[PDB]
Amino acid sequence: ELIEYFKSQMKEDPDMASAVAAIRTLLEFLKRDKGETIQGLRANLTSAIETLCGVDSSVAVSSGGELFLRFISLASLEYSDYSKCKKIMIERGELFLRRISLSRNKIADLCHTFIKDGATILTHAYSRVVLRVLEAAVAAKKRFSVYVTESQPDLSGKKMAKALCHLNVPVTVVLDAAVGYIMEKADLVIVGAEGVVENGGIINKIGTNQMAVCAKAQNKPFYVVAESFKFVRLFPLNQQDVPDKFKYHPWVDYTAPSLITLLFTDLGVLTPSAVSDELIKLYL
Amino acid sequence: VPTRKDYGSKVSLFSHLPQYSRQNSLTQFMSIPSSVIHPAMVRLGLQYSQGLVSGSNARCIALLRALQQVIQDYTTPPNEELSRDLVNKLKPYMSFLTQCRPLSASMHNAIKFLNKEITSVGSSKREEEAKSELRAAIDRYVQEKIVLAAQAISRFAYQKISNGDVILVYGCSSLVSRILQEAWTEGRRFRVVVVDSRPWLEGRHTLRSLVHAGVPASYLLIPAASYVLPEVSKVLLGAHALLANGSVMSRVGTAQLALVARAHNVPVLVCCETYKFCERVQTDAFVSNELDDPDDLQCKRGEHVALANWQNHASLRLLNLVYDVTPPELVDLVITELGMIPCSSVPVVLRVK
């Protein structure tokens, strides 16, 4: 209907993530909902999340939808009036949006310390989180070089290099097949994530997993920068266990937590063993 | 010749290896003018026991010079042939030298080569001619197995050193020092990181050898090797022997350094000559090693020595290993006088020659 129009118009901010826009659309449609019962609202918003992930096939949209449903259930467990409960839901959603829209800056502030002077950083594709981290690092009078792969499916590496050149940072574009070649000249690898699975692994661009192995074979540190709304309760046993709704040439793949050193979220610097703890404490 | 006596209580895992004391010697129960053993052999054994010759090629050179002197002072008895008599006579000398200090692989190879050369002597050959030919053969062996074999290794290792490299060396090695000095003389500009270990502390023999040459060198102990390795470009290690299975037998602080270097993506290079290649194999430093004087582990820290009287404690053992074995998977390149061959081509060189 018109929910897709609003969701696609909310993505006029180039810095706004897809999951953030989906959550904003869900909150707007919860505000404008004329329902008088909690079950009808839950069902309508569930079908709306279904439509949203039908429009955008990213894992972040599904993660945000599940987080919104869990927040709805948590707010409904308390008051049980659906009027005062609705006001509480509205104010809590406002506060949650205001707190989650500034998580990238906090991630950058807490992650930019791990970058030394004169080190070499390896990135896979274009991501706003790595860009903000590198900007916060170069703002602290740090000097380093950046290697970025081209990400052949959609040339996001050239876009990342063009965005980094405006920051006066030496950047070099390498091919996807030359990952194992420049791995010895890189001091650390920093990648983003589209979704963090239960065990601790990530779900990212197709050329990420093969880069986490080549780093593990050389004891290179491998850091993942991702927000908190990307925590999804999924457990892929292998590359085939990933749902086809997210992969569709595959557009995404899974990386095991044993190849990940640290995660930098708005909750802080965590190990791959903390995502499962957070998901269990949330009772999603 | 009386057998050497054991000193101290040895470790249960190393209870099959002889452990001697540097203070006591066998010359107390021998003639002052030596009769059963040659005087040159007695001097060589005393130098080996006192630690005056504590290298690998130096020990072989000293042994070959002593053998040349013995052959020069040798006279074949009547009714006997030189080929068998000299071989039967040189056996108690080697037994006494082993009693003084366990022989090295280079010494074993030299003894085998000399025994073969003596056995390959004709019957109609004169005595003086045979002795002179044996001396000339020993001289040619020293020339083309140590002197000429080091220049080829220095020339092969020159193309592997680049400007701005950080080479990490360990202990004292003649070949490594010669390679570094010749590389600095040719025009290569780099810096060396010297690693040492207790109680010999022979790495200082290399450090002061580089400062006198002009190479910028640093010094640190083996427990702090993981701290300086992130800035190391390549690791140059010396080898006492290359076994037939690819393993490297060297100073006890070699396999550990090669293992820690693997975790930092630092290539490990091994330099050794083809005359130190052993046809035997070894998988761990427990089957064959050397137990040095356990009283060398004592150190004066502060005012007193914690190991001043360690014999009083019954269940207190002091282990002082000398050699260790590195697996072939931790070695990347082996430099010899024939070329830069992998660590798995050791039997091939053993089969060609």
From Swiss-Prot, chain A:
The gene is EIF2B1. One of its GO terms (molecular function) is identical protein binding. Activated by the chemical integrated stress response (ISR) inhibitor ISRIB which stimulates guanine nucleotide exchange factor activity for both phosphorylated and unphosphorylated eIF2. One of its GO terms (cellular component) is cytoplasm. It is linked to Leukoencephalopathy with vanishing white matter 1: An autosomal recessive brain disease characterized by neurological features including progressive cerebellar ataxia, spasticity, and cognitive deficits. Brain imaging shows abnormal white matter that vanishes over time and is replaced by cerebrospinal fluid. Disease severity ranges from fatal infantile forms to adult forms without neurological deterioration. The disease is progressive with, in most individuals, additional episodes of rapid deterioration following febrile infections or minor head trauma. Gene3D superfamilies: Translation initiation factor eif-2b, domain 2, Translation initiation factor eIF-2B, N-terminal domain. Its main location: cytoplasm. GO terms for biological process: cytoplasmic translational initiation; oligodendrocyte development; response to glucose; response to heat; response to peptide hormone; T cell receptor signaling pathway; translational initiation. Transmembrane segments: none annotated. Belongs to the eIF-2B alpha/beta/delta subunits family. The modification N6-acetyllysine is found at K31. It is found in: Cytoplasm, Cytosol. The lineage of its organism: Eukaryota, Metazoa, Chordata, Craniata, Vertebrata. It holds the Pfam family IF-2B. Component of the translation initiation factor 2B (eIF2B) complex which is a heterodecamer of two sets of five different subunits: alpha, beta, gamma, delta and epsilon. Subunits alpha, beta and delta comprise a regulatory subcomplex and subunits epsilon and gamma comprise a catalytic subcomplex. Within the complex, the hexameric regulatory complex resides at the center, with the two heterodimeric catalytic subcomplexes bound on opposite sides. This is Translation initiation factor eIF2B subunit alpha. Keywords: Acetylation, Cytoplasm, Disease variant, Initiation factor, Leukodystrophy, Protein biosynthesis. It comes from Homo sapiens. Acts as a component of the translation initiation factor 2B (eIF2B) complex, which catalyzes the exchange of GDP for GTP on eukaryotic initiation factor 2 (eIF2) gamma subunit. Its guanine nucleotide exchange factor activity is repressed when bound to eIF2 complex phosphorylated on the alpha subunit, thereby limiting the amount of methionyl-initiator methionine tRNA available to the ribosome and consequently global translation is repressed.
UniProtKB/Swiss-Prot annotation, chain B:
Keywords: Acetylation, Cytoplasm, Disease variant, Initiation factor, Leukodystrophy, Phosphoprotein, Protein biosynthesis. Activated by the chemical integrated stress response (ISR) inhibitor ISRIB which stimulates guanine nucleotide exchange factor activity for both phosphorylated and unphosphorylated eIF2. It is found in: Cytoplasm, Cytosol. GO terms for biological process: cytoplasmic translational initiation; myelination; oligodendrocyte development; ovarian follicle development; regulation of translation; response to glucose; response to heat; response to peptide hormone. One of its GO terms (cellular component) is eukaryotic translation initiation factor 2B complex. Component of the translation initiation factor 2B (eIF2B) complex which is a heterodecamer of two sets of five different subunits: alpha, beta, gamma, delta and epsilon. Subunits alpha, beta and delta comprise a regulatory subcomplex and subunits epsilon and gamma comprise a catalytic subcomplex. Within the complex, the hexameric regulatory complex resides at the center, with the two heterodimeric catalytic subcomplexes bound on opposite sides. It is linked to Leukoencephalopathy with vanishing white matter 4: An autosomal recessive brain disease characterized by neurological features including progressive cerebellar ataxia, spasticity, and cognitive deficits. Brain imaging shows abnormal white matter that vanishes over time and is replaced by cerebrospinal fluid. Disease severity ranges from fatal infantile forms to adult forms without neurological deterioration. The disease is progressive with, in most individuals, additional episodes of rapid deterioration following febrile infections or minor head trauma. This is Translation initiation factor eIF2B subunit delta. It comes from Homo sapiens. The chain holds residues 167 to 519 of 523 of the full protein.
